[PDB]
């Protein structure tokens, strides 16, 4: 395959698709190595902005942002306008997950009880249900009908209609005590990765403990449903064989793109990065490291591989002078 894009493109009509071999890999290595900031979202009528979480509206018209004061504001992406403000929590919105369909929304806070809630996103902004002692909540990856709350080393499973606890996944012996542990659903929904222990949702039985090499990072499922990514070490979900060691992936808030082709890493520990990595999903080769030159607090992307929202602290991490705005990137 050619390296020079113009030659690659000339072979692209020859010779399609992607000209020679490795696509594509070159095209993604060119595209996802490039990001132009196009707009900022400053908090309402406050002199100092206090966003802590970024998330796009399900249909992605508004980009939803969490305030530190526990609010939630949907800013119209095109217009810029704060279309609406809702009072969610009494502490700093740490997490936002819009129901793919846009009927619901999940929220997590800092210390205020309840720490998590489900809210009506249709016509009326109601509280649907509360998860009080759960510090992180995530939707089931399938057709989102359940909620996966964590409580430190312990997992929880809830029904979005009933709001009732169904499962409590935890084995104190198999537990790794991953500091920033987060219990996530598998791409098929039947498996759970929690505190480095892979489980089986239906049987409510543990499958494996991915040997401790990191101290904070719990890991994610690759969307192939074949591999699992505990910090660096890329393990196979059925074999438990180590596949590769990606040293560039150490200490990363990793999040795949919509098509599951490019990984977005966010380096953490002032704590969190001033920069972020991208890698090619197909073969774990890094693409780039982008220095946003500002302390990032969160990062998200749209389905369309068009925008990159990032919560950047405009001015040094001094108790006082903290201005968390939201910046927007193109690709």
């Amino acid at each position: 395959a050619p390296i020079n894009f113009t030659s690659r493109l000339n072979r692209r009509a020859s010779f399609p698709k992607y000209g020679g071999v490795d696509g594509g890999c070159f095209d993604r290595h060119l595209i996802f190595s490039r990001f132009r900031p196009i707009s900022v979202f400053r908090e309402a009528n406050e002199d100092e902005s206090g966003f802590t979480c970024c998330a796009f509206s399900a249909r992605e018209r508004f980009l939803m942002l969490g305030t530190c004061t526990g609010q939630l504001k949907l800013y119209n992406v095109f217009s810029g306008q704060e279309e609406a403000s809702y009072n969610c929590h009494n502490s700093a919105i740490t997490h936002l997950e819009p129901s793919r369909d846009g009927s619901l929304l999940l929220t997590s806070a800092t210390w205020s009880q309840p720490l998590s809630a489900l809210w009506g996103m249709k016509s009326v902004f109601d509280m649907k249900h509360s998860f009080t002692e759960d510090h992180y909540v995530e939707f089931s990856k399938h057709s989102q009908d359940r909620v996966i709350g964590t409580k430190g080393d312990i997992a929880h499973i809830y029904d979005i209609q009933t709001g009732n606890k169904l499962l409590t996944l935890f084995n104190p012996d198999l537990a790794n005590n991953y500091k920033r542990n987060c219990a996530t659903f598998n791409p098929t929904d039947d498996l759970v990765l929690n505190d480095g222990v892979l489980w089986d949702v239906r049987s409510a039985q543990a499958i494996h403990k991915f040997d401790k090499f990191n101290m904070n990072i719990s890991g994610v499922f690759h969307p192939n449903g074949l591999e699992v990514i505990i910090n660096t070490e890329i393990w196979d979900l059925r074999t438990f064989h180590l596949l590769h060691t990606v040293p560039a992936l150490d200490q990363c808030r990793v999040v795949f793109n919509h098509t599951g082709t490019v990984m977005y890493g966010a380096m953490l520990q002032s704590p969190f990065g001033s920069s972020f990595r991208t890698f090619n999903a197909t073969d774990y080769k890094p693409i780039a490291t982008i220095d946003v030159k500002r302390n990032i607090f969160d990062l998200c992307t749209d389905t369309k591989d068009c925008y990159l929202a990032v919560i950047e602290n405009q001015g040094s991490m001094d108790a006082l002078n903290m201005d968390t705005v939201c910046r927007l990137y193109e690709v």
């Binding site: 249909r59 018209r61 530190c68 609406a84 009072n87 502490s91 210390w111 704590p271 108790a319 903290m322």
Partner: protein, 74 residues
Amino acid sequence: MEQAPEDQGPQREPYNEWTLELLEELKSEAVRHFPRIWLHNLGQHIYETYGDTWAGVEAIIRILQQLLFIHFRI
């Protein structure tokens, strides 16, 4: 497409009554992670710069509220 909901959530409510209560709930939660000598000292700062205004209230409710967030993230 498109449209945003109706805020029929939390509402403020009778503010100042609420604001005052939230500050003292937060003031305690802050105290369980930060030395109560540093936290007071931040309160004056805020007081000299803002004054006995509500605007200044929310700005310690913001400063406090942010520290705890970073603390949580570490």
